[PDB]
Design a protein around this ligand. Structure first.
Ligand SMILES: C[C@]12CC[C@@H](O)C[C@@H]1CC[C@@H]1[C@@H]2CC[C@]2(C)[C@@H](C(=O)CO)CC[C@@H]12
Ligand SMILES: C[C@]12CC[C@@H](O)C[C@@H]1CC[C@@H]1[C@@H]2CC[C@]2(C)[C@@H](C(=O)CO)CC[C@@H]12
Ligand SMILES: C[C@]12CC[C@@H](O)C[C@@H]1CC[C@@H]1[C@@H]2CC[C@]2(C)[C@@H](C(=O)CO)CC[C@@H]12
Ligand SMILES: C[C@]12CC[C@@H](O)C[C@@H]1CC[C@@H]1[C@@H]2CC[C@]2(C)[C@@H](C(=O)CO)CC[C@@H]12
Ligand SMILES: C[C@]12CC[C@@H](O)C[C@@H]1CC[C@@H]1[C@@H]2CC[C@]2(C)[C@@H](C(=O)CO)CC[C@@H]12
Ligand SMILES: [Cl-]
Ligand SMILES: [Cl-]
Lengths: 313, 313, 313, 313, 310
């Protein structure tokens, strides 16, 4: 068929859109993609399909997508074109078409890891339509048709809300009008897992590094093993932790925690080296160094943990 | 075509459903997905298709799916629309259509890892049908048509039973009635593998850490090597083990075992540090500490193992 | 079309089947799947297609799959429906259809790792056909049409034989007769690779563990490094080795070898701890322990290797 | 249909091409591939489609691709044939066809890692068309139709520009003329990530290796632990780092940095061995060695870092 | 349609074949597969399609005329092909041209690895129909490869075809098989700096132990033990890149000899330590000789090895 001609001769055709999330899975932090399976509902007026509700003994009548003109609606931030199965098409006596499909798609949406792993994100799904030569087409949001099933889960996340920005973005693209809607899924990460995946190994490794201050200054190899193995452990945990993320330029909150832990551990190494350096000559100085490290380190570390967990919680 | 109109003018069309599991594979603990290949059987009454068994020399007659109306049956908790090959369609003289297809699909079903690796799960397969404007459609379960092939296996699991909840869940979705059935595959994990993957390295690492109490207190480096390497081994086993699971918020039984082992090992480190701290001044105290530790540690560890394996077995 | 009517009115239609392996690749131990690319040949009698060999000056005549009835043959133990390209269809004057297609498929067949890596397996490919309402259909095996190309290889394996069980399994399924053939690919693993992947690191790690008995008893740290590092090496090799297999409940022969090596190494640890425990008081006892160990350990290990390699070779 | 015949009887048909990047993702350094989703716009003259703008009350008129001849345009440096959805086809009264599709494709384009990770690249997308026997076909670039969406991101790169080389490469291939255009996406890597992934572990490992010069020369085991563990750490970081790249023949800037760090650390090992060799006889020599090393090493390292970061920044 | 009937009534129809490599990527050493994207060109004589050039090239759609079913043997799935052109000649000569991509499965010989050369094979095959026997041939004009073809780890020597095909019987029909051969040689330098250097340096490090004071037993223990475990790790790591081949590669030999030298250094340290109190002259002599023999035997070994495999 052809696009619905304008009654006002100069009126844009608006398509009322709605998405209802059925399934949400495969949120890939490294790929910054996730997979979604949902209903897409579109609704518009085409009087050419109108009919008398009394002369015609049918109350609605239903068409197949090949029978009538349907607007070409595309997703923007997606990897391939979605896979969709048309579910239903119902026309009204006045000519109002209500189209309903179920689709799955891999959406590509960038994440802000600065606050990670205490981060919240807004996943975006951009709808777009390109105007034809006969008529301009404009997108709109039917709030009645937006929502998500209750059994929608992201195993690592809390799902806050799924909403749409009602006013669309209309703009020129290659000499035609495009209309783009922004659906927004707000989510916040469940950080507890990482607490026992990285934060505990780091804190315990720092404590282990601090145990060296209580060993006899003359047993140099023991303290060497402690300091060195704790340093290498810190480095390994750092690299391991950053291996979960994409190659982002900035630093995450976990990056800061790990870097400060590395500071404390390397400071323990420098302390061990200084004390050993002063052990023969000036044993009073070395002894005082151990005494102060033994008080300062766990105190500064406790204060640091307090400021950090107070801040990011 | 269109849906069969009701004879009672107000009667819902019920679709008799059945699933027969043929193949079950690719149970991914991290993705909380598994792949299934089975028969789907549907059966309903469409009088329009009735025929004279005598005038028509056929006792059944068979149609192609394009020939007759077939209800749109969808899976809910699936990643993509299933891949199906229609196997057979048999109409009865009275108009009873019996439809049979074979499908494969990737089902997405969440797992409860709290008791892991001693966990049981119910994998769900939700069938759903959406009512059309001419008639409401309702799902039901033909028990004769439910089951699973004997050579169905989950390499890591024992399969208990495959049953269906007979009463469906009917609800409103985007202004239409939907009918949902819940097929339930009950399975229980075979934990033995993990016993030799994680639990043994942990137990042996604890014993190794305890060996340090029997080394001469003056040979500080040896005990340092024991304690430190055992601590780092415990940390490595913990991280490694938790790397097999999805980012669940809670803690598994394995988490508890590993955490208690880590408690014992780090406690052995603190013991070595205390003994070394009291070795020059008050050697009687240090000696008494080792004397008691050699009895307490393996005893508390044996008791703990008793409570744990007694509980989770 | 429709299925060939029976001449005996009560005679089952047999389909003569054959598979000719062209390519065999991607044997996945963890997934218990492999990919196969082969010929499938079917042969049956449809009198409707018969013709006079003299009146018709053609010796065979060939049809397209859409032209004639073709039996719906399905694989059982497969992940998706196969991908098939029809190669040829030739009818005989008497009505004998010979159909030939080339297909690729991902077959799922469980492996028995108990004897691994000295294991042999039977990979299964189950063919099946479902009876229609007009006639019962039964599978059979045409040995002339079974075989494999000589350049068929599964890297890391010896291919013994590819045969078929001639008598099929006929059984009732959802009120219809099904006919199932069992094609069997017998293979045996090439263990030599693992000899240099796991067995040598273990044997050398045991020898290294035994070196500790010859170091001076007063150099406690050296022996500590030996015993501890060798123990951790054993643990690492065990975990690494079991990482190649699926989560099987049982233990493989490699598992037994590694476990016995761990027994010897941990026993060397206990020996080092005992000798160190008796080094100050009763130096004769410790000396005797080292003296005996230096003979017993490598002897018991040699005998063990003798029994093991004698058994599994 | 067939291609538009030439008016000059000898004139080549040019197709005006444009690509508008919508989505850019999955830049795989190891595979040297990336995935792209964009608009492809083609424009050519087919006087067979001309029409009177007055007799025909329409100003453009739009066709389906099956209705009219469309040039076979292929990508060269792609893995599979692209996936395209035709978006619009608009003819002008003069016969000017404007075709617009949206496609996704996996482009294969080699990278120059010599300056990695301080590298810039030009990703190429080569368009090509093969001439038919009725007419030669030539490609051209419509600058109005080239560009990229503002929300185009490579989660690790700065995108400089997306341009086209206007003069195409025309050449003979298998006895027909081929016409090839070169679209060029210029990008430059964000190296900061690697600074904290590899460069910091290396620098800290070097400093740690230098700490050994300040330990008492008599505590030989401590210095041994330092030097040896730092050497193995350097080796591990080197291998790990090169594990991110494809098997390129040449050496990267990171390769040079790591190799120089390895030089400094192994030189620290040789220094420790020499000092230990001269510790009993000629302690003055050993002392002089440590005294000089403590000044030389960190100076040569500082200067080295200055030249390196000055050069590659 | 049906296959072209023979003019001699008993003559086989030959199909002139050619492959032109456009794209070559994803050579997987572990899977022994590679991916190829190329032109396939076929040429044969069908007089039924001949025509008077004066009364009337002319081009058909593949559905319009009979086209021979040509299959690849050593492939995982059937290729994906887009027909590019079909041109008939006045005499009936059909020239068909398609562009295809396929994942070819071809075994590699790792014995000389990583100094190995390989011949990747692409086997074409055609099955004879009941009306006529079909035989394959090679149109040299139609064989080649684009210049910008690269294997990101290999030097490409040549791409040629064996002109004489292999004809044989398969399930009661004649099959005709062509062997296209892509000769390549591996660029070993990467492995030179991935494994061989860590091995050589690990051996040197193991040798440093002979110069430490014999009384400092723990230091030498650290050297020997860590160097041994490093050797083991490098061996396992290296063999993790290859399929589970039965035989041994040249890298296997280099790593095995390095392991021999390192474990020999461990045995030397243990012997010296065993004789340090009683017979210190013997231990001293052992170190004296070792310090000369080890680096000499190792240098000579490297000379023979790199001389041989280059
Ligand atoms: C920072 C630097 C010099 C600059 C690089 O070579 C790195 C070393 C690391 C070890 C440091 C050394 C400076 C002197 C220190 C602090 C010694 C002292 O207490 C001096 O009395 C003990 C450890 C030594
Ligand atoms: C907990 C803390 C201080 C707070 C952090 O720096 C961590 C260390 C770890 C080592 C501990 C130390 C406190 C004092 C201990 C218990 C010593 C004593 O028995 C003193 O009698 C031996 C080991 C020492
Ligand atoms: C097995 C056990 C007890 C049970 C767990 O606590 C683990 C320890 C590990 C260290 C063992 C100890 C038993 C006594 C041993 C063998 C000592 C003796 O030869 C006594 O002469 C040296 C090392 C000691
Ligand atoms: C390079 C070489 C010989 C050649 C291989 O066996 C490797 C060793 C490594 C240890 C080196 C040795 C040469 C002599 C050195 C430099 C000793 C000296 O200062 C000599 O005064 C200390 C460490 C020794
Ligand atoms: C090969 C064997 C015995 C057989 C297995 O238990 C493995 C050990 C490994 C350590 C070897 C030992 C034999 C005796 C050696 C060579 C000692 C001597 O110099 C003998 O004087 C030092 C290291 C010892
Ligand atoms: Cl579905
Ligand atoms: Cl393309």
């Amino acid at each position: 068929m052809v696009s619905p001609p304008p009654p006002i001769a100069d009126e844009p055709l608006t398509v009322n859109t709605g998405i209802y999330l059925i399934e949400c899975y495969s949120l890939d932090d490294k790929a910054e993609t996730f997979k979604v399976n949902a209903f897409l509902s579109l609704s518009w007026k085409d009087r050419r399909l109108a009919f008398d509700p009394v002369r015609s003994g049918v109350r609605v009548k239903t068409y197949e997508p090949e029978a009538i003109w349907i607007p070409e609606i595309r997703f923007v931030n997606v990897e391939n074109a979605r896979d969709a199965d048309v579910v239903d098409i119902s026309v009204s006596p006045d000519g109002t078409v209500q189209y309903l499909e179920r689709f799955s798609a891999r959406v590509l949406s960038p994440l802000d890891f600065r606050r990670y792993p205490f981060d919240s994100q807004t996943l975006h799904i951009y709808l777009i339509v390109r105007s034809v030569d006969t008529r301009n087409i404009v997108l709109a949001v039917d709030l009645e048709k937006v929502g998500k099933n209750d059994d929608v889960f992201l195993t690592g996340w809390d799902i806050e809300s799924f909403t749409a920005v009602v006013k669309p973005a209309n703009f020129a693209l290659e000499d035609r009008l495009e209309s783009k809607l922004d659906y927004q899924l707000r989510i916040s990460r469940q950080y507890g897992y990482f607490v026992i995946q990285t934060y505990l190994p780091c804190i315990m490794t720092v404590i282990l590094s601090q145990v060296s201050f209580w060993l006899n200054r003359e047993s140099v190899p023991a303290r060497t093993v402690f300091v060195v193995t704790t340093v290498l452990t810190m480095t390994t945990l750092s690299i391991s932790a950053r291996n979960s993320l994409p190659k982002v330029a900035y630093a995450t909150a976990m990056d800061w925690f790990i870097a400060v832990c590395y500071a404390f551990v390397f400071s323990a190494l420098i302390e061990f080296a200084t004390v050993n350096y002063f052990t023969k000559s000036q044993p009073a100085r070395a002894a005082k160094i151990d005494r102060l490290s033994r008080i300062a380190f766990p105190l500064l570390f406790g204060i640091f943990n307090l400021v950090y967990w107070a801040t990011y919680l």
